[PDB]
Amino acid sequence: TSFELVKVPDPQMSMENLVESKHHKLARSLRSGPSDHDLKPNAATRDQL
Amino acid sequence: GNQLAGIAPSQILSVESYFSDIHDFEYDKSLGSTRFFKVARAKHREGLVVVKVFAIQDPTLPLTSYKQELEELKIRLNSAQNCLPFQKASEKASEKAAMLFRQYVRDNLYDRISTRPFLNNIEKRWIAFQILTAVDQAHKSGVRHGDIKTENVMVTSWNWVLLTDFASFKPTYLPEDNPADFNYFFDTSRRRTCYIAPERFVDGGMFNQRTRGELKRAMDIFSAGCVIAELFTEGVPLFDLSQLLAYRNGHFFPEQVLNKIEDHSIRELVTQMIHREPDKRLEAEDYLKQQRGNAFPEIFYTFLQPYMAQFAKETFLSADERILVIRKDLGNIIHNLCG
Amino acid sequence: YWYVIVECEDQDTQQRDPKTHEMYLNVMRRFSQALLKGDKSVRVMRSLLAAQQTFVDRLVHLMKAVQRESGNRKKKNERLQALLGDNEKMNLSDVELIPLPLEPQVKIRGIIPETATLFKSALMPAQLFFKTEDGGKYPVIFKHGDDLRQDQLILQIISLMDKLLRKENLDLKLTPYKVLATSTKHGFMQFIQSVPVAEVLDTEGSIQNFFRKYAPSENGPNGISAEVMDTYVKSCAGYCVITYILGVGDRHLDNLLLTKTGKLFHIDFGYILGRDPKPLPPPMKLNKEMVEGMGGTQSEQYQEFRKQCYTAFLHLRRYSNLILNLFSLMVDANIPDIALEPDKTVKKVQDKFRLDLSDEEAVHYMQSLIDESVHALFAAVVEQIHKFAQYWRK
Ligand SMILES: Nc1nc2c(ncn2[C@@H]2O[C@H](COP(=O)(O)OP(=O)(O)OP(=O)(O)O)[C@@H](O)[C@H]2O)c(=O)[nH]1
Ligand SMILES: *C(=O)CCCCCCCCCCCCC
Structure with missing residues (x-):
């Protein structure tokens, strides 16, 4: 019924960022386990790494 | 003081110990x-x-004069939607x-510049529009921020943008x-980024009233002008403390940082808001009038600003x-947002 | 033993984070038991440490007796030396053989009761000579009321930089003198016998005059023994570079000590990581008298000194990762200058290495810094007011 410090309540205050969580799973895919023994970074990605 | x-006793003991009390x-x-x-986050009802938390390692320091100004600044911004006072x-x-x-x-x-989802071009404009609206709602209310930076926006x-940490004490x-x-006062993020209006840096020959003379409205327009340049560059600062004092003396210019901005209309806005001469900087409200349709879609003023204020x-x-x-x-929103 | 027991004696941790305090208490109970479960030769260490503790406790009790303010320095010194030779109630003169806390290899038989005297300062640092088993006297300074943890850290990090540069065969002749906090307000420091440069210029008038009085030789460029001036050149370069990276703050000549062999060293670290009570301090400990010892910017010594500085700097950048990782673990270590800004502390040290500059550009940066820092004579002016303040305290 009352508030004096938190003027602008935010419903997503301490919730997990589901959009960021979605980007984890796609960008860091484990299914490449068998491919990554063969496939390795090329000239342009060697420098970058 | x-x-x-620089005495150690309170500072070594600081942060978590305060909350125990x-x-x-x-x-x-x-x-x-x-x-x-x-600065610490706390849970509250x-x-x-x-x-x-400030450690008062000097009992003669008249904090009551800062306390008065804090309560007064709060009462003014008590109804500024984009301004969150202490x-x-x-x-x-x-x-x-x-x-x-x-x-x-x-x-x-x-x-937010780097957390996901990345702010779409329309969202960066919506935030820039609210930065101007935040400084505007402060200026019309009669308060100046004095330290507008992306860490306080x-x-x-x-x-919903909330300008915070009004720097009445700095x-x-x-x-x-x-x-x-x-x-001590301004570089609390240690990024060396300086968004302090150049007319605020003065020769020692100008100097205690200089420490607490009133902030000029045009001093915030400069700060907000840099926050928008940083936002549209995605974290690239407009000036560091070495580059700003060189900018103040006319020996530096953020040409390379501004050319990085994609939106030609925002680079025009920023070039004006960060103009060195303070008299050549318009009130925030004049940038809102000037950019209506020119950079901030008409929808922002007529519908989004008054609708979002509901929340x-x-x-x-x-x-x-x-x-x-x-x-x-929803029907009213689609109508107002899709013609 | 001493590191963990400092935490167990840390009455602040006992109240602000008791969970961490009790962890150290259990670390000490574990170590107490792990030694008892060791071999016969290991179990003896448990009893030796128990002896060290009561030895230091009795030493603290003697200093607490002096601290009672029962009279002037005379009566204090009398009580001090009388208690030391009290072979019945204290016997610190000839206590049973114990490894010395500050340096355990230098086993001690007791304090020589004739030699203990407190220096003329508000901290009352007591000079102590330890009767080693080898029959030699080992010089140590005992301090009371001073939390040596800041010095302890800042010395144990220069000892590493000295060691690391020695791995590069660049022995700059630093003096990483040892310091050890026995408690939050008690500890020992290695008493490197030397004269402060403030007293050198008050007695011989100049560093070169002092070297001519204790190491003269016509073979050197200015009448100073080549082996002494070369030591000074490298010692100055080492402390200049290392106090710049560690951002050591104060510059008082009263705390820059000079050895007769030319090893210069700095002993005041109460102000580090960029902070100095004097506003706008110079960037580094490169006072003009330090350069006068080399005969100014025109001498061969200055050309070599600059070369040693940029080389010592360039090789610490090689080990920046190691140095930084040793601060991240220290971020919560209660060191006064770290507890001011813990999350910024590591960022401050990382700033000094200029890791974004390429190696040739890092030389030019350091070169520009030293070529400019000679002219920041403002600290040499303001230090005259500090001496005036001390005149009222003596
Ligand atoms: N998400 C979030 N981050 C915050 C908040 N307040 C502060 N921070 C972050 O914590 C840092 C430290 O707090 P501040 O002392 O306010 O830092 P600052 O705003 O740059 O410094 P000031 O201008 O003196 O207020 C800031 O740089 C922000 O990155 C907040 O309310 N919400
Ligand atoms: C001198 O070195 C210290 C000056 C400190 C000025 C800042 C004080 C900030 C006070 C905030 C308001 C507190 C109200 C109780």
């Missing part, structure tokens, strides 16, 4: 500690709070500590040759109510 004395708060995460403020200032929270309490906001604009989870004018004022209101539209209201208004 903390700058001259106060009842309504639990420490939650130190957001940052500096010589000046020991109303939600997350940010507490900036809601409480307790002089006697501990034997030698003073605490400034305000709402904790989901993200600061510096984080907060953003709720629904892109010095208005700073000696050009002595960084000891900038470092910034303290009367709690809970997560269920907000959804039910948007569902009710």
Whole structure:
């Protein structure tokens, strides 16, 4: 019924960022386990790494 | 006095120990500690709070004069929607500590620039529009910020920008040759980024009234002008302390940082807001009038600004109510947003 | 033993984070038991440490007796030396053989009761000579009321930089003198016998005059023995570079000590990581008298000194990762200058290495810094007011 410090309540205050969580799973895919023994970074990605 | 004395007792003992004394708060995460403020997140009956603790290692320092100004600044901004003032200032929270309490906001604009989802071009404009509206609502209310930077321009989870950490206590004018004022008061993020209006740096020959003379409205327009340039570059600062003092003397210019901005209309806006001569900087309200349609879509003024203000209101539209209201208004929203 | 027991004696941790305090208490109970479960030769260490503790406790009790303010320095010194030789109630003169806390290899038989005297300062640092088993006297300074943890850290990090540069065969002849906090307000420091440069210029008038009085030789460029001036050149370069990276703050000549062999060293570290009570301090400990010892910017010594500085700097950048990781673990270590800004502390040290500059550009940066820092004579002016303040305290 009352508030004096938190003027602008935010419903997503301490919730997990589901959009960021979605980007984890796609960008860091484990299914490449068998491919990554063969496939390795090329000239342009060697420098970058 | 903390700058001259530099004595260790309160500072070594600082941060979590303070919360052991106060009842309504639990420490939650130190957001940052500096010589000046020991800032920690706390849990509170109303939600997350940010507490900036100052160690009063000088009993002669007349903090009551800062306390008065804090309560007065709060009363003015009490109805500025995009402005979140420090809601409480307790002089006697501990034997030698003073605490400034305000709402904790989901993200600061510096984080939000890099956290996901990335702000779409329309969203960067919506935030820039609210930055101008925040300084505007402060200026018309009769308050100046004095330290507008992406770390103080907060953003709720629904892109509602809240300008915070009004710098009534930080010095208005700073000696050009002595960084000891900038470092203690302004560089709390240590990024070296300087968004302080160049007319605020003065020769030692100009110098205690210079420390607390009133902030000029055009001093915030410069700061906000740099926040928008940083936002549209995605974290690239407009000026560092070496580059700003060189900019003040006309020996530097952010040509390479501004050319980085994609939106030609925002680069024009920023080039004006950051113009060196303070008299050549218009009121924030004049940039809103000038950019209506030119950079901020007409929708922002006519519908988005007055509609979103519904949620910034303290009367709690809970997560269920907000959804039910948007569902009710959905037809009106599609109409107002798609012609 | 001493590191963990400092935490167990840390009455602040006992109240601000008791969970961490009790952890150290259990670390000490574990170590107490792990030694008892060791071999016969290991179990003896448990009893040796128990002896060290009561030895230091009795030493603290003697200093607490002096601290009672029962009279002037005369009566204090009398009580001090009388208690030391009290072979019945204290016997610190000839206590049973114990490894010395500050340096355990230098086993001690007791304090020589004739030699103990407190220096003329508000901290009352007591000079102590330890009767080693080898029959030699080992010089140590015992301090009371001073939390040596800041010096302890800042010395144990220069000892590493000295060691690391020795791995590069660049022995700059630093003096990483040892310091050890026995408690939050008690500890020992290695008493490197030397004269402060403030006293050198008050007695011989100049560093070169002092070297001519204790190491003269016509073979050197200015009448100073080549082996002494070369030591000074490298010692100055080492402390200049290392105090710049560690951001050591104060510059008082009263705390820059000079050895007769030319090893210069700095003993005041109460102000580090960029902070100095004097506003706008110079960037580094490169006072003009330090350069006068080399005969100014025109001498061969200055050309070599600059070469040693940029080389010592360039090789610490090689080990920046190691140095930084040793601060991240220290971020919560209660060191006064770290507790001011814990999350910024590591960022401050990382700033000094200029890791973004390429190696040739890092030389030019350091070169520009030293070529400019000679002219920041403001600290040499303001230090005259500090001496005036001390005149009222003597
Ligand atoms: N998400 C979020 N981050 C915050 C909030 N307050 C502070 N921070 C972050 O914590 C840091 C430390 O707090 P501040 O002392 O306010 O830092 P600052 O705003 O740059 O310094 P000031 O201008 O003196 O207020 C900031 O740089 C932000 O990155 C907040 O309310 N919400
Ligand atoms: C001198 O070196 C220290 C000057 C400190 C000025 C800043 C004080 C900030 C006070 C905030 C308001 C507290 C109200 C109880």
